[model samples]
Structures are given as C-alpha cells and as structure tokens.
Target: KVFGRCELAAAMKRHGLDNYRGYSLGNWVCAAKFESNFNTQATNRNTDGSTDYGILQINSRWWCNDGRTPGSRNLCNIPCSALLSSDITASVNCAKKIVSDGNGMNAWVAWRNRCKGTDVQAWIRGCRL
Candidate 1:
C-alpha cells in the first residue's frame, strides 16, 4: 500500500512517532517520502548482502532478520518479511526502535541526504495531525 503524504503522516502519528526521540512527525514524513515513497512493500538490497525492508527501509543486517544476511543481529527481533506487510505496526515499531537505538534518524541515508536540516513542514503541510 502506497500512502498519500498526509495519510502517511497520520499513520506515523498513530504509531507515536510524533516528536519521538526529538524527531518531529514532519521529519519522519519527509524521510519516508524519500526512503520508500510511502510504499509499504518497498524493499532494497544492500551491497553488503543485506536488505532494507518496508516504507522506512529497515535494514536486515542490524534490524530485522531476513535469514540471509551474513551477520544479522536481528536487533529489532522481527522477521524482515514483517516489514513489508500492509499492516505497518511492526514496521513502525521497528522504526521507533531504530530511532531509540542511538543511530537516530541518520540511520536512513535518505533522511540525511534529503530530509535532515531541511524545512520539512512541506511534507505535512495540510495534514491534520
């Protein structure tokens, strides 16, 4: 399921991402826009034999277990497959754990390249949070 910008923002909020780890909802919305274009089923393979899964692209190497990464820690303690589900609760929970696990939002390169230090208000411009 691909979410509209506002819809994505609302969903993130529903999962308690608003101001989580001092990162605002708009920042999450912006990151998701660049990371996976709000597509719930998005996935990306890394050069290091790991994969990133779901809208926020949680990585298999450190987060979810895909049963393929060479040294996967499965830190998020969930299957990588769960991230791709249209039901985003697990995905969002994993993302929240990522934010809390000391990497911050910088874990997502897309956030650093496109969302960090920018005025992300536009990502949630008219959204009723």
Candidate 2:
C-alpha cells in the first residue's frame, strides 16, 4: 500500500524537505524500501543484538557509539531513537543528511542511475510535484 500524497507532503515538510515534491517522494520511498524495507526498527546484527540498533540499521558502536546502550547519540550526533521515531520523513532526512550533508537528492539521483537504470536528471525533469 502506498502512503498518501497529502500525508507524504506533510511528512516531507516536517523533515525539512519542503523544497522536495513530485517524484522526490518516489525517490525517498524507493531508497528507504531498498535500504531498510521502510521499517523504522529494522536492524542488522553480527550474531549478537549488541551490535547495531534501531532503523536504518545504524551500527551502534560505529555510529551510535553506545553499542547496546539505548539512546545513543553517535550517528552524526543524532540519537538513534530519533532516527527510529514515528516521524518517518524526519528520520529519512536525518539519514540523508548523514550521508550527503543536505544534498540527498543528488545521492538519490546517483542511486536511481545505478539501481533503477535510469538517468537521474531525466527522471527529475518529469516530476510534477
């Protein structure tokens, strides 16, 4: 099931992504789905639960810095729980910022080119939102 456009728009605004609309949502959702299946609590483990934590599968020791401790603020200084919060778009934006320093759309375009087999710029040209 798809998240409605109005809801997606509101979420985008709450996540400092008001400048993005149209196919941007598609790009975000596509990336999230590819990265973590859109699950805020998704995580990866190295044969132990003490390794990674929260959604985006952030490494607790490397990113969160607390390992098994709750409320770690190591992932780019933002708490892991914050990234896993119900505010999906906020979490997504946070992840993007960590990866691209607010140039997530650029990364998205790159991802689209490599994964979706499309020219990222061309796809963006057809966006209507």
Candidate 3:
C-alpha cells in the first residue's frame, strides 16, 4: 500500500521499526522514501539478475525468491510476495531480523547513496506522527 508520510510513520512506530539498527525513525523513513516511496509492492530488477522486494527492497539474492532466480538464501524465510502487502507486518518482522543480523540500514544501497549524511527529518516533514 502507498501510505502517506504520517500514516507510514505511525505504522513504523507500531511495528517498532524506529531506532532499529541504531537508526532512528527518520532514518528508516528516509530509506523507505528513496528505496520504494512507501509502496510495499515495489520491486526492482537489478543488473545482476536479482530482484529487490517490498518497500525496503530486500534483495532476492540473499533474502527472498522470485521464481526466476536460481538461488536465494531466503534469510527472511518469508516469500517475497508476502512483503508486498498492505498489512506490512511480515515486511516489518523480516526487516527487523535483517537489520539485527549486522547489516544495518546499509542493506539498502539507497540508504547509503541518498539518505546517508542528509537531514532525514524531511521525510516526516509534517502532519505529526
């Protein structure tokens, strides 16, 4: 689902996604914005033939499957389609595990390329979370 900024922030808070990996709510939200614009069904096909899934864009190479992919670590263990849902609970749970595994927000190249060193508070610029 494509959630508004405040709605997305509130959902993240309820899922305890804020402050995960030593990254604050702003950091997480910032990463989501750049990664998938808060659309859970978002997917990206990488040049290496792997697909990134969900709002966080968990990579197929190491996290989930896309049928066409040859191999997947399935570290999250949840199906890639499960992450692409309005419910978002599965995605949140998987993201927590991934971040806790020492990958941190650096799991997303967008976080490093765009969100890093930037003022992420702009991600929730208004409407109060």
Candidate 4:
C-alpha cells in the first residue's frame, strides 16, 4: 500500500519506529518520504549493484536476503520480498534492528541528506501521533 502521511506515522509508531534509537518519529517520517515515498513495493538499485527495498529501502547487501546480492549477510534475517509487503511490519522491525546496530538513522542516506538537522516535525505536523 502507498501510505498516507498520518497513516504511515501511526503505523511506524505502532511498529516502534518512534525514537527507536534516539531518532524521533518525525525523523523517520521524513526519511521515509525521501527513501520510498511511503511505497511498500519500492525498489532502487544502488551503485554498488545492491538493491534497496520497501519504504525504508533497506539494502540487500547487508540487510535482507534478496538472493541477488552476493554474500548478503541478511542481518535482518528476512527475505527481501518481505519488505515489499503492504503490512510493513517486517520492514519496520528490520529498520529498528538496522538503527540499533550502531548505525542510528544514518543507515539511510536520504535521512542524512534531507532529514538531519532539519525541522522534521513538519513531516507529520497534522498527524495525530
């Protein structure tokens, strides 16, 4: 599903993205905007020949086992296809793990480029989080 702003906010919060690693809910919301524009089926190939999947665009090389990235560690312990699900539960869980692994929100380049040091609250201003 292509999530609406408030819906994505609530869903991610329910999945524990809100301050999961000292990054605020707004930070996540903003990052997702740039990452996959809240598209569950989003996929983008990285220059390193890896592919990013789902809303958070978790990479195949280090996170999900896409069966395409050579020697993927699959640290999320999930198939890459799971990230494409409309439910988003698996994606959010894996995203939390990514941040908890000392990456913080920096795991997403979009977050660093667009969310960091920005007023992220606007990303979910009217959302009843």
lDDT against true structure, model 4: 0.91
Candidate 2: list runs displaced more than 4 Å: 1-10, 18-23, 46-55, 59-62, 68-75, 101-129
Regions of model 1 farther than 4 Å from truth:
none
Top-lDDT candidate index: 4
TM-scores for the candidates: 0.97, 0.49, 0.91, 0.96
Residue 99 Cα positional deviation in candidate 4, in Å, after optimal superposition: 0.4
- In candidate 2, which residue pairs get closer than 3 Å at backbone N, Cα or C atoms, i.e. clash? none
Model 3 residue 27 lDDT? 80
Winner of 2 and 4 under TM-score: 4
- Model 2: residue 91 alpha-carbon error in angstroms: 2.0
Superposed Cα deviation of residue 59, candidate 2 (Å)? 4.1
Model 3 TM: 0.91
Candidate 4 lDDT, 1-109, residue by residue in tens: 8999899999999888887778889998999899999999999998888899999999999999988888678999999999999999999999888998886888899
RMSD of each: 0.8, 6.2, 1.4, 0.8
Q: Candidate 1 on 9-113: residue-level lDDT in tens?
A: 998999999899999899999998898999989999999999999999999999888999986799889999999988889988998898887879999999999
Model 3 ranges off by over 4 Å = none
Summing lDDT over every window of 10 consecutive residues in candidate 2, give the lowest-scoring window: 119-128
Give the least accurate 10-residue stretch of model 4, judged by summed lDDT: 15-24
Error at 45, model 1, angstroms: 0.6
Note the residue pairs that clash in candidate 3: none
3 versus 4: better TM-score goes to: 4
